[PDB]
Structure formats: C-alpha cells, structure tokens
Design a protein around this nucleic acid. Sequence first.
RNA 1: AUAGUCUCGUCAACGCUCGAGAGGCAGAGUCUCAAGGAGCCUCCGGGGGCUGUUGCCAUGAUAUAUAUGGAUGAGACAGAAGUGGCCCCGUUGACGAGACUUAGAUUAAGUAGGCCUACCGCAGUAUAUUCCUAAACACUAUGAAAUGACCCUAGUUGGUCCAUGAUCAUUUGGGUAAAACCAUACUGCAGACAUCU
RNA 2: GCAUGGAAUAAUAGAAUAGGAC
Lengths: 139, 94, 12, 58, 58, 344, 57, 121
Amino acid sequence: DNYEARMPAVLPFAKPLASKKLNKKVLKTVKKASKAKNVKRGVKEVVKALRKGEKGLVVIAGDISPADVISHIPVLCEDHSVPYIFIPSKQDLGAAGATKRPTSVVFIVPGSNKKKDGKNKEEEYKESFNEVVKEVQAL
Amino acid sequence: PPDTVLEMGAFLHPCEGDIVCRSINTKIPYFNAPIYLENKTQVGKVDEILGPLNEVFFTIKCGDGVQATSFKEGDKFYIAADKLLPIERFLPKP
Amino acid sequence: KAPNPLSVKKKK
Amino acid sequence: MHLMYTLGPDGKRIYTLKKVTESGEITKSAHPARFSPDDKYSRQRVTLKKRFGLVPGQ
Amino acid sequence: MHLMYTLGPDGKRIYTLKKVTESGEITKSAHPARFSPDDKYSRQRVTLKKRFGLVPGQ
Amino acid sequence: DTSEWPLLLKNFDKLLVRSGHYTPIPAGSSPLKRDLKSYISSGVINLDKPSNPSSHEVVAWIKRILRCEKTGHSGTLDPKVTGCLIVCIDRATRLVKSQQGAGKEYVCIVRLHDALKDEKDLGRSLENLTGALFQRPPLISAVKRQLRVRTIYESNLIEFDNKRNLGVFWASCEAGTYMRTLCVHLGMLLGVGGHMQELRRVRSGALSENDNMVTLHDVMDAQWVYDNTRDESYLRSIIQPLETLLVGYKRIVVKDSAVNAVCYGAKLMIPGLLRYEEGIELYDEIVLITTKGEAIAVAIAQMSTVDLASCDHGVVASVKRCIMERDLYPRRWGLGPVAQKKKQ
Amino acid sequence: DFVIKPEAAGASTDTSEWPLLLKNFDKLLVRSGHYTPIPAGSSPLKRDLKSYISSGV
Amino acid sequence: YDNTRDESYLRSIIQPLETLLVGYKRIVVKDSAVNAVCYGAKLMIPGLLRYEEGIELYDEIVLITTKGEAIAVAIAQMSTVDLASCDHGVVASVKRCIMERDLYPRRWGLGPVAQKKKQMK
RNA sequence: AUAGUCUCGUCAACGCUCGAGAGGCAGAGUCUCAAGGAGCCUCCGGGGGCUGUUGCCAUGAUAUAUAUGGAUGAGACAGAAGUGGCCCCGUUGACGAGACUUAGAUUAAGUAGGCCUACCGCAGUAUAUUCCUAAACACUAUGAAAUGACCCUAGUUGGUCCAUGAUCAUUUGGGUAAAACCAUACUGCAGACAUCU
RNA sequence: GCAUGGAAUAAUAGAAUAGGAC
C-alpha cells in the first residue's frame, strides 16, 4: 500500500527500517499515544524534549528532502540512551500523529499529560508501547 | 498645459487599473511623465517601461477619476515632446 | 553632499 | 516549497511542480534546509554520515 | 524550375534535372527566393529560426 | 590523459609550445596539494544559499565559521533566493568579478493573479521578452533605479499550471538582470497580472549547481571535523581552489624563474614564456600560470599569436591583477645570458 | 602529482590551420626575427563590428 | 544587430576583405613601417620581416602585418634572391592602399641612419 | 623643390553585352487567369478513374505556338503616375580641384629635472571614530495546532500558508547591512629580457 | 538606492579674539 510507494524515497542512513507487522504496531502505537496526548511532533519539539531529558521511543520519517532536517537526530538519541526507529512514510506518520500535515519526527514519552484521563489512556497504552520498544531494542 | 503633443502609445491592456500601451513613437518617455489625450487632457503618468528593443511597451498609472476599463482598443495616448529620450542613450557605449 | 575629510587630503 | 527536482540520466536536475513524476519517480525538494550559526549539532551529523560513508571527506 | 541540386559528401553542390536522384534523395531548388527591400518580415523569420537553432552564428 | 588533469592544467597538451625545456624550482605546490592554511586562504566555496538569510549575512556566517581574514561575493541577489552562490575566501576575493561575462542562469516560478484564456500565451510572452530588454531595478535592490538594457539570451517554459496558476521557467541572462521585474513584465503583458513566487539560481558565473555545490551545514561540519579530529579531507572536499574561477581564460605558462619577477610587478617577456593558447589576441584578458598549475596573475596580452611564436624578445603580457603571494618563488632575475652580457 | 614536466608532450605550431592570410606562415622566408611589436591594430576576424563591416565582403 | 544587439549573425554572413587576397604573394611589414606604407612611402629593407618564395620582378604582392591584416596591394621591386642578398634597397611600391592611414602610430624618422641624416640636415 | 598616397570632376584613346527610355527593379489600388465546372463509367448517398499528352491565362523570347510556362506566378489599366524610392559598361593616359606625407622603420627594463629627487610598475592601509537611539531582514527564548491559520460579494467540494513550524502575541538575547573597482592621501616592495641542465 | 537621528572626538570651507617669529 503506502510502503510500496514510499520505499524508493528512503534515505541511505535510515537504519533500522521496520517491517510490516512492526510498521502497523508502531503506527497504532503513535495513534494511541496521540490520543493520550503523549506525542511530541516536529523536529524542534523532539529536539527540545531530548535536551529536556525525557525518555521514550523516537519514530523518524524515512523520506526527508533535504536529509539534513533529520540528520542530527539519531546520534542525539543515542547520546541520551533513547531508542529510535525509522518509518519510510512521513504522511502516514503525520496521519498517525492526529495532524493532516506530514510530520517528520515523533517522540513518545509516558506521563507527559497531567490529566487523569490521559493517565488512564497511557495505562492502557503501556503494554503495546512496551512490546513495541522491546521489538525495537531487539533489532 | 503642453504646447505640443506627440503620439506616444496605443491601448493594449487595462490590467490592474493601469493602461498598457504599445509605444508607437520611437523614443523613450521620462518616468512619471504626464500622458495626455489629443485635446491635451492629462489622463495619467508613465509608471513602467518594458518590452524588447523592437517592441517597446509602457504602463501608464492612471490619475484619480480615470478608470482603465473606460478605454477601448485602438485609442491613442499623447505625451509632451520634452518628456522624451533617445533610445541610443540607454544602449551601451562603444 | 561633500567629500569626506579622509577621502581627500592635502599632499605632504 | 513549490519547486521540486528529479535526477536526469545525465545527472543534471529536472525541475517540476508535481510531487510525483508521471514515470513514477518521487520528486525531492530543490531548496536546502535552513541554517543558523548558533547550531550545536555538527558532531551528530558528522558521526551519522560517517557510519554510512556519506561524508564527502571519506 | 529545372536546375536542381544535392549536397555532395564533401559539401559541394551536384546539379541535375531529376527531382529524385538514383539513391532516392529528394533534390533541392538551385534558385534562391525572391527579395524585396520593403520586406517587413525579418522578425518572424528570425523568431522561427531561433526556435530551432537555424540562425547562423547561434 | 591530459583531459583528466585538474583545474588549469586540463588539456595542457593543446597549448602551443614556445620552449619545451626548463628546470623545475622546488617552490610552491599544486593547488590541490597545497598546505591547508594556504588552501583556505585561496579557497572558493560554491554554496547552496538558503532562502531566508541575506547574501551578506551568509558571507559573514562563513567568515565567522572559517575564522578567515575576509570573505566576499558578487551578485545582484534578490532576497529569499536559494541556489548557487560563490563565496571567495581571502585572496580569492580579488576574483569575485572575474566571470561576470559568463552570465547567470535561474529557474523561476511565476505566480499569475488570474487564469489565462489559453496556455500558450505565457510561452509566447516568454519568447517575446527573450532578447534585449528595458528594465528598472526594484526598490529592494541597493542600486539606484535607472532604466537599463539587459539581455536574456535564452528562456524555456518548463511547466505551467492554470489551476495552480504557477509557471516554472528556466532563463539564461546577462549579469544584472532581475527575475522580479521579468515576472512583473510577464504579468502585465498577459494582462492578468503576476509576480515572482520563488527564485533559484542554477548557474552563477562559471560554477553551476553540479560543480561541487555544498551547503552551510557541510561547511560547519568540516570546520568542526578539522577542529576536533584534525582531519582535513572534508574541509578540502568542500573548498575549491580559486583556479576554478579562472577557467575559460587563455593560459600562458611561465618559467619558474620569472614567476617571482611577475609577482614583483614586472612585465612578462618572451624568455619567460613557456606555452600559450592558440589565438591569443592583443589587449585580451589572459591568465599567467606556472607549471605546477597555480595561477600567478591575471594579465593583459601585449602580443598576438605570430609574435608569440616568432619574436625573440618583448613584452608578452602586463599584469592587471596579482594573485600569487610575493616571494613564494625565489627571485632569479638578473642571471640571464644577455642580461649578464649587458651588465658586463 | 600533476606537473608539466620538462620536454613533455605538447602541440607544436601548425600554420596550416591558421586563419586567412596567415596560413602556411612557415613557408615565408625569414629576413629577421628581431623586431619590436607595436600594440596597435587587430586581427581581421577580431575587429570591432564597425571596422569589421567597413572592411567586409 | 539592431534589435537584439547580437553580432554573431552579422559576423557569420560578412567575411573579411582579405579573403579576396588569398592568392596573392605575401610580404610581412614591421609595425613601425606600416604607417609609412599607409602614407605612400616605398617599402624598404628595414621594414621587411618575411617574404614569400617565388616573388618575381614587377609582381603583384600583398603587404601584410603580423596580425594578418592587409596593408596594401603592391608591385614587387626585387625578387626573392635579391631580397635575401642585399642590405639596402626598395622592395615594393604601393599600387592600392587598403589600410586606414593612422591605424598604426607614426614611427618613421626613428632609427640610426634616419636620425643621423636628420642631425646632419 | 621632387615624389608618393587618399577623395573627386573633365577630356582623349582602346575594347564590350554598344550605354537615360514609350526603360527596368521595388512598392500601392482595381480587374482577369488555379479542371473549384460538365458528361461517362465504375467500387462501397459517398469514393476512384476517363474524356483530360484536354480546357483557362501569359509568351515569337537569336525560338518546335501540335511549343514553352503558370501562385516558389503571369497579364491589363500603365506610351500612365512616380523617382524629393533605387539602377542603367570597363581599362589606360592626360588635365584640373582639395587634403596627408616627403617616411632608410629605433628601443634585451622607463620618463623629467637638480649622486639625488619626483613620476611610472606591483602589493597593502584609510576614505571619518566611540556611545545611545530609530528602522529593515532573519534567527533564537516562552505560550498557543488539525474543529490549524489567513484572504476574497463567498464557492455542488474557492484560493493561500502550514510540525521541513503557519498565524498571533510576549520581550529572551545576539546576529546582518558585504565585496570588488575608480579617485585621493600614506606605507612598503623591486628597476626584473628569466641562467638554472 | 545602499541602517535613521542625537551627543562627544577628528578633519575641513572657513571667519574671528589673544599673541609671537620675520
């Protein structure tokens, strides 16, 4: 579907690339976390959150022209012991992030919402998030 | 009022409230020179000079109370003869 | 509308 | 922004408005990313491009 | 007219009456076009020749 | 294999030989094999200028990054214009306007206020404005607004969309031409009104976007690599010699004994000449280079081909601009045979 | 490195490819090679357009 | 050229006048003697640089400079062997002067024998 | 004085296509001429072929008119009008008129003055300096986003911008406004014909 | 047309007051 279209546009340094079950797990994960409002979207917000020191998963769009927009991010994630994964579609990542526009980088941190409803949503979210980050660290 | 007037331009387009004219005359007008009709009545001032050397166009900024849609094709616009410059002046010197 | 004093100077 | 490009067979750029060429190529943006002098991420870009050999020095 | 020519391998003219030579090449007319000093069509000719790069010295 | 030789030594065998024999002087180096300080002090950066800064701001940022003595550029750039920008560093700043006669080439997006009746009107107007043109500079430009005649050599309508009201066209133009006034004049002649949406320069002077164009990020990264790791390869990769700006010039190779004499302001003579291009004309702007390939100077020829081939003595060229540092080569003048005969 | 070496391969002069009235210039016998050129005049093909047209056929 | 200001098409259609002088035998004149020949002086030995082989007595010749442009159509006054042999003499007389008069500077009267004659005069 | 060159107007001689007209070229107006018609046959109302080496128009030009051409044209008005739109043969010699020279072709590092000075060549420095403040552009810091923001007599889906950071605020602080050349003044470097085997 | 205005400093087209040297 969207993979077959967006695959030729991936950047060479985009490692690791998720497979299909991992693709759907990551996208449903981002959708659930954005429903829980734990998601930070855009390069600037994710960079600021990483300098702030919160921990979680990073999802980076794989077709970014120019590449420099996402060039500094994986090493910065490694400096803070923060796992990261690449998805070759930015439109799917934006749509999973509850915005119509494409979003290059998504940073998911637990417990970033002061609302109790967001806390319950994160509590339901935590099992899938743990499974996804375990599969990420398995790579 | 000018003493004499010369055939400066022919109406081409009324675009954006300004008059586009093909330059019938073979000399280049001054910027902001007054443009008249043949009864020596001021219609507007020269706003822009454009076009290639073989086909020079100029855009007149209409004065207040004058509308660009009121004119028709084939109309002529006149300028005082003092407001002209030779074409070879703008050409590079040998 | 005048030349600068450092632009034009008398010869030594 | 609006101006996009694709690589020709010779290697020179071909400029287009469409996001996807009719031949199936995906057009890339023809404008470079913005630069700020107060930027502190040279090390990250150098390291990441060095792991893949994309550094022009290497 | 009757005087026809084809361009030779070395770049020189070869004259014949025949409209088509033995090899099958269609012959050209040796006589140039009529001219008038009041010809007001230099612009159109230059434009059409510039569209296809047929102006000498281009 | 001389076509693969770099910089100004490319196709050196095509040069007519005046004297095939000389003895090398172990002074100086190849432009690509220079020491790094002399490489940066003679460097030229072909840069992908981003949209929102100014040209002077970008040059100042490069000056701050490299910590060099001076930087400079040459161009009548509109604001918010990406693309090709040549930044000369230190000594190379004397060659900012050496390739002004080569012209420039833009790819421009024009936005039309209203949809055209037919699509071919924009193409007809684009071929109409190809040629000499009357232009007045915009108020944004720092130069005074006066009517000038500027030549657009070639134009080509790459694309046009009525629904998007956007037209992409490539234009090759003389230096000093503004695409903003071009788009304005197009908008008046179509009668719907239009302006410049986007502008990108795809060729400036001798260098194009294919000739090793790098971004500001690459410059900062290479400077950081040299600062922390002491690796010069990335800095040498991004930075081009000034000889890239001197291509297209007729070349004269000078003996190593005469390089310092030319650097001291002397005229080039016949005994200093080694090789020369075919068809050198009197009062023509040429480049004096040496056998290592580095450019001594930009000179004005005082001889034609017949006198370069047949005459035994006389002024070959006169220095217009000097590029090489003084005393880089040892001074060897006064040791010639007829000079020693005149001294004795 | 890429350095023009002594006695390297280079194109010698060929007056057969030289332009009009300079073709086969080596065939002319040489009275003297010692002279001082005067920086005046122009080549026939390199004249300015006024002098080129005024001298043209 | 009138409207675009391009000169390449005029330069393509128009040929130099020296195309009419290809078949003539060439004599190369020093740049000091060019203006004197343009003023109607008879060319002599000191103004001579090169002479083409095969030049006969009273033969049609073309006087050319080192830039290849044609000074004049002249009548040769000595043959090739006489050009090589003698040290003083007249080599040509101008039949038709083609070059403009003051295209080159006036450098006659500047020489050893010329200034010696001027001083004794 | 003598001689040469350039630009011209007359005469004589010699050749040629034998040279100012009811002439030709270019241009404007009107009219005529293109098998665009007619009759036969056919193949599927249409198409093809033939009568048709035909017909229509022009041309006797060193000329086959049973001919040669026809829009990449011809003829009449026009023996006109017009030329202040263009064109109407070359060579030699002599004479006369306006001029430019009377020329032997220099210089293997300069010019002008009193060993020195100034100019000349090349490379540099300055072309006002410091502080405050006004303005422009862009960045950065903070709060606001997908029921996102803005514009238009305004929509059966209008347009533009937008996490590659839009549009508002808040002040958070710093950055940019060059470079090349000319001219002027000053400083420095050398007087360079290029050996190097 | 190239960042506006003010204050201080420097130079200038200078003009003056108090003074020398000649």
